[PDB]
Design an enzyme around this catalytic site. Structure first.
Site, mmCIF file in Angstrom:
data_model
loop_
_atom_site.group_PDB
_atom_site.id
_atom_site.type_symbol
_atom_site.label_atom_id
_atom_site.label_comp_id
_atom_site.label_asym_id
_atom_site.label_seq_id
_atom_site.Cartn_x
_atom_site.Cartn_y
_atom_site.Cartn_z
ATOM 1 N N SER A 1 5.400 -5.847 -1.123
ATOM 2 C CA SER A 1 5.698 -4.423 -1.194
ATOM 3 C C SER A 1 5.909 -3.844 0.201
ATOM 4 O O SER A 1 6.719 -4.356 0.966
ATOM 5 C CB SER A 1 4.579 -3.689 -1.930
ATOM 6 O OG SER A 1 4.330 -4.300 -3.186
ATOM 7 N N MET A 2 5.183 -2.780 0.532
ATOM 8 C CA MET A 2 5.313 -2.175 1.855
ATOM 9 C C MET A 2 5.090 -3.206 2.961
ATOM 10 O O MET A 2 5.662 -3.099 4.045
ATOM 11 C CB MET A 2 4.354 -0.992 2.019
ATOM 12 C CG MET A 2 4.395 -0.343 3.398
ATOM 13 S SD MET A 2 6.049 0.175 3.925
ATOM 14 C CE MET A 2 6.556 1.172 2.530
ATOM 15 N N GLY B 1 0.791 -1.217 0.000
ATOM 16 C CA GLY B 1 0.000 0.000 0.000
ATOM 17 C C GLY B 1 0.826 1.272 0.000
ATOM 18 O O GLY B 1 1.935 1.310 -0.536
ATOM 19 N N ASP C 1 8.854 -6.840 -10.222
ATOM 20 C CA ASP C 1 8.285 -7.699 -9.191
ATOM 21 C C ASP C 1 9.141 -8.942 -8.980
ATOM 22 O O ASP C 1 9.542 -9.601 -9.938
ATOM 23 C CB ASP C 1 6.860 -8.109 -9.559
ATOM 24 C CG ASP C 1 5.901 -6.935 -9.575
ATOM 25 O OD1 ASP C 1 6.265 -5.856 -9.063
ATOM 26 O OD2 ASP C 1 4.780 -7.094 -10.101
ATOM 27 N N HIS D 1 9.300 -5.002 -4.773
ATOM 28 C CA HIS D 1 9.435 -4.242 -6.005
ATOM 29 C C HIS D 1 9.654 -2.766 -5.692
ATOM 30 O O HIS D 1 9.651 -2.364 -4.530
ATOM 31 C CB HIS D 1 8.214 -4.430 -6.914
ATOM 32 C CG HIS D 1 6.953 -3.828 -6.378
ATOM 33 N ND1 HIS D 1 5.700 -4.233 -6.791
ATOM 34 C CD2 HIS D 1 6.745 -2.845 -5.468
ATOM 35 C CE1 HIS D 1 4.782 -3.531 -6.161
ATOM 36 N NE2 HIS D 1 5.385 -2.679 -5.351
#
Lengths: 6, 187, 190, 183, 186, 183, 183, 180, 190, 180, 184, 186, 6
Positions: free
Chosen positions: F89-90, F60, F163, F114
């Site tokens: 991700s986050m 997010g 990714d 990523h």
């Protein structure tokens, strides 16, 4: 429209 | 739109253009700038072809935009030719106004056509000051329309005012008696 | 989520939502669009506070762009009717009906925060239909305009002519300007 | 959010002093709630006045009439107060309060007019519903005449189109009995 | 759902629990409702103890100026010092409220960031009214710049130069600019 | 509907009492601040005891995540992190930000890393301002990733350009987590 | 939800170590089930937990958070299929403790391969295609492990949607038995 | 809202009455299952009451209720109020024999499963074969509970078939009409 | 796309769209919903044909579910005004105004195709607004209903009473039933 | 559109008549410009007629017509039919002095420019500055053509102002009313 | 509708094209731009010596589409005379100033607006950098070419195009955007 | 509205007039119908004169690959040299068809630009089907890169590196890269 | 509302 409108 | 042939040699026309050749103009459906300007152009053209021959305006309309209709009204009264009007189906509001605007003695209703009259409709949104401006204007418009209705129908001004405060329907015979149309077109 | 707070009442401690808690200290919030439901809620609060103490000042904190005039007027008339002085405070903005209710506070107890702003203007409206009905509603909004102007004159001390001239178009007043104009009595500092 | 007080929500609190609010649009559910409040209050004390604070643009006639009939049935006088505006069915319920106990706040206003409606379908059914709304209109005018003291004729004339009345005009018209002035 | 917690002397949702310790959160976009809630909390805490510091934890992209200014003026008006902490980001009105904290009591978390810029607006209508509203936002802009200069210690001219377009500042840059006083270290 | 249990709590509140915080789904300002509030609260209850952050998230907003990251590093308690299902991700960033030795993957959970995603629209001048900023953000995120994983800065950069999925064992090998949690 | 002595009905059943897995499998409902399992284990590490499954399936990573928790905790997790258990729902059903997986007589089960999709550059399409194929491989392995079927057989039977009645599910090794009246 | 007395439905649940109201689907169905299990736990012998007013709905959702009804020890007595159509009709007839009722002016409607799929022909056949299996099972269970032959059930459910209360009794769908 | 066809004439070869080609044989199509513009086009075609030959029959081929009454009546009045008999043929269906215009054809020259059908009923309408205005519009549609029934009586030979009874609700007539009812004169046989 | 071979408008264009109808915008305006340029090339001494029925519209588009009207050698006679409002009224009064007409029941409305912008304060000032300049130019040009003072125009166009045909003549917006 | 005239029946625009007049009307985009390119190429073929006229009334639009017109103007042998009617903004203004020196005109009450490119991208940081760098290069080229055609310094152009900048006809002449105002 | 012109008399829309001189326009997004129209034009021109050059004027953001490849294969099939000119932009498939012109006869206008990159796609469904479609788009990418290498003279390795992400080339850069042969000068 | 509403 004739007789008279034409 | 069907095409037809006129021998002149012989040539081709869409049916409305063919009737225009006989000085017949159709006013059909909603009254608004574009259909109205087209009618004005036709009237001017017909006058230019022969300034003294009658022109025929066949009306079947629920009415519409007042200014658009008034462009037609003013053109009708300006041009030299008498504009004979015929109501087929219905002529309501501005439609009825333009019907009655025809040359005296040459305004007709088909036996089962009907007419409806009423006062101007409008609307504005904004500051009170601007509301005052636009309310004042539509009241002036209402006044003019009533005066012109009185003129063409021969009804007293006060009577027009009373009869147009709300929607009023007029059968063909009633339209004749009202002075909105001159007679009913019978076979 | 409205935060809850502990109150220490003499009967032991209790739990209130933040706005209910502030109501107990006689603060009422007038926030956002002015309309029927938020207005009647404010009216109810004012009547309650008076019933609780008819002498103590009531504080009406205003952060609003304004809204429906009739709704605002139910607040105005309640403010004038009740015994307690209604002290008004402008925070963020008080525009249109918001500015009117601000200036309608008890003389001497109307405040602007240093960076709040006020905007005044004339009634906005709109009707659609028959010319006869258009005239009826046009006439009415002009009557409303006249009344609002008379009341503004009353509360600001400005002449009716000055108010009329100043409200024909949107007019912004800074906090110091609102004081000068007589719309508020002073600016709240520290 | 409805504020709580000492533990009641603000409206329940005022209901305890026999004050009921009529707020915004008139419709079945908000109206039924007002009916319940009136019946309950009557049960609590059949002799004590009930108060109906009105701020409304009007709404559904049948819903408003459930309120009207209840106001008339219960023994307590129902005092009515116009706050901000009482228009249409709102104005009707305002004037329907107990005589001598109907009020306008000084800057509140009132508006009256005739029933609005509409139908779509066969001519036969159109006649049926047209005939009905005309009957409704007749009843509303008769009741308005009754409560205001105006003649049915005058009511009919004054409700054909939207008609506004300031607080003083409402008093003069017999819609309310007086204007509420500060303590 | 907001977690509930217990305090042995009460039941509190976590935010109410922290409010009891005089901590207020300013989260997400600034607009009337969240802002008035913040004002309410500040007034409540002032009345609870006017002498004790209040803490405003900021994570916001900014938003409505008038709503933000209601918070600003309340901050300056109430007796308690309002200590501010930037978490994640404080952008635009978010950055304005961050720097408006009590001098010496404004903090950035190490990896938080700040962004400053000029007022955004819009009006539609007659030229006359356009002019009225244009003048007003220009006055708003001038006031905001003056207040920024006051709180940061930068000259008005410097503030004007730096806010004409979006400018980002890292936490250390925010300290050096005078936006905050220090970076919060473990 | 969240189930209630008895010691009466909702299930998440009951687990909070044991110093467990859930990070669920999309990372954004509001859920992020709630996690910050929980961490600060747990620290105050006991500055010495470990705190647990259970992560199941697709990622997010970066700034939102960084409020959590900075809080994790600020508070005295070690924050132990557990990847359940996925941490992308986050989400993956916050997972690896846990206390060294105390970061776990469930056996069949997966991680994805990523580079930052963004977007702007407007004048070229403003496009440049915002492009420069996201590149700075990318740089910082890569630095912090290197710090927590033991990987080199440029290795992080190479591996996150597109990714990149990592199984639990691969996440351990990469230095993203410390071990796989077994029964 | 109805109340009983109060709890809501689901909280009441939770006290008896019954957890419901209902409708669509995704992050939030899944983490909620994880919290319930962790809570139940803490309450009693030795007593069985019951997972009642009525689900069309859903997100794989979300489902795997449940799966891993089921395998991690000390208590046996007994699974019951009511109505349907499809895809990830069917997967979690068969993941129950051996001997304690049940179908109701007219419940039905459906198994198939992972569904997915990506849009973008060819390079990224390959990355994500490769990943879902790895996922497919893992799910098939775990299906083989829990059913006792060979990997090859599982692969054959999951290429396209495959339905199983309760009796067929028992025969397949997906569940252990059908739950009937029983005295 | 739901009137307080407890709220009305919880109050009736205390007397072992469960409502099946409106569309049959997973969440309303799972709630009914939970209620049945709870009631069995309280008292395993006492009758449970399922008041049905429903147009039917999702088959798998309905079957979770059916299987629960058949599993638990208590007899599940069913009452049709207003309507019991499709899956609703199925659950009505699934009640304990002798304890299935129609209110005098309630009605019942039966028919065959409705479904839909789209995709490759191979997958179309897979899903067509599945819904046809469902149809077969539903017919078998209807035959069992009504006492009608499988053949008669097959014939009578190809198209929507309405049954008045007295017709429902005669068909074996319910046991009797509830009179004063 | 309307197909083009060739007509061989001593003046030379001419190309026509197929409807224009049939218009040359005094055949007019009334197709689909009746509304102002399609209706006006039919009026124009009829006036044109009368001008061409005042003595020759005109043919109106009808396949219509009906539509706007006033639009339909513009056609009806044109049919009755012009000198040529207007022969009407029902193909597929003639419902509502469609059925009305079918029966309005010249006595003895109204036809149904063997498997075409007819439907008759009363006017449909709708209005919204003040009770006063509702009454005005209600009265009007009742007058329209009355007129339409009178005309139906005139053309079918049925009494007004019978027409009223048969049109209160939708009434379908097969081709033979249409002939029996006096609505058309015969079925087109081959 | 009727044919008379030309469509009716092309036919009237042959007599040097141009129609300005509906909303004033780029495309309709450039078409009018093209017609004006063509007519001048045909004969630079013969009058051109611009028939106006319009609520107005985009100012820049209107100004392309205005500048073309003033540039070309022929007098451009203007006639108001139905309405000429806003930019429509402006183009009406821009016609050759002595050859501007109103139909008896046509009406005119005049007012000040309408606009709007959203964005940074700096940009808002730029665009506000510009529309004020436009407003000033338009008022100056109105003063030039009507014979009214600039002050008169400014004061009278701050808000919508309607003028009947006779009032438009009195105001100097047009030269006379077209009559029988 | 487009009026027809007789010389052969012509639509009005085809009729003016015969006199070597091309209209650039409304938003600049691929299809209208390529149509303008075709017209220019055709006119050059007919007569490579005679001037061509480009009448501009446009709020601007897509830069690459506009640049297809620009390069065609510079490539062909005929001088391309440009006339601003109503408004020439953005790319519209750019093409106006790109006309042959001495043959660029403003109508007396037309106006011009200039500014820098607008754009927008969404995606990975790496790609954001690629597209941001590109639009900056586009910005640089447009400014360089403006400097070339106006005679202003690059720095002056840059300062004047950072934000929306309006020029009256007289201002445009003074700035070197056009050469003169068209007088009756 | 497409302007009409006169040839030596006959009247053509301007595009038909230019087609008479063997000029074909490729304008806007590449897709089946616009692409097929270009193929028809090319086949017609070859039949008219198998010897004379044909001209393809390109201003396109690119588009559907298969549609573009119908044009490509038609270009390579016909006997006439197909000369290509980039006006405004030739991006993606537009750039591909530009460089696919006859060697020595590929042009950029001085301020036109080019962009190159790899195929874009997307599929949704079963893993098995995803693999089938992923496999295919990788094959397409491979073919496109091979053909680019062929036409530019760059190594396949270089093309692959340069097309992994969006890559812009100015007119001079396109010449240097071998995408076109020269810049059109006057 | 008191004096008389209450």
């Amino acid at each position: 429209f004739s007789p008279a409108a034409p | 739109v069907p095409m037809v042939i006129e021998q002149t040699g012989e040539r081709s026309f869409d049916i409305y253009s063919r009737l225009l050749k006989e000085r017949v103009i159709f006013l059909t459906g909603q009254v608004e700038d574009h259909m109205a300007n087209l009618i004005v152009a036709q009237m001017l053209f017909l006058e230019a072809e022969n300034p003294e021959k009658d022109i025929y305006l066949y009306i079947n309309s629920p009415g519409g935009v007042i200014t658009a209709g008034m462009s037609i009204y003013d053109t009708m009264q300006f041009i030299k030719p008498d504009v004979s009007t015929i109501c087929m189906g219905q002529a309501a509001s501005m439609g009825a106004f333009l019907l009655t605007a025809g040359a005296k003695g040459k305004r007709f209703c088909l036996p089962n056509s009907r007419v409806m009259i009423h006062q101007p409709l409008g609307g504005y949104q904004g500051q009170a000051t601007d509301i005052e401006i636009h309310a004042r204007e539509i009241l002036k418009v209402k006044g003019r329309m009533n005066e012109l209705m009185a003129l063409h129908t021969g009804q007293s001004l006060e009577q027009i005012e009373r009869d147009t405060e709300r929607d009023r329907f007029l059968s063909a015979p009633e339209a004749v008696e009202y002075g909105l149309v001159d007679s009913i077109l019978t076979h």
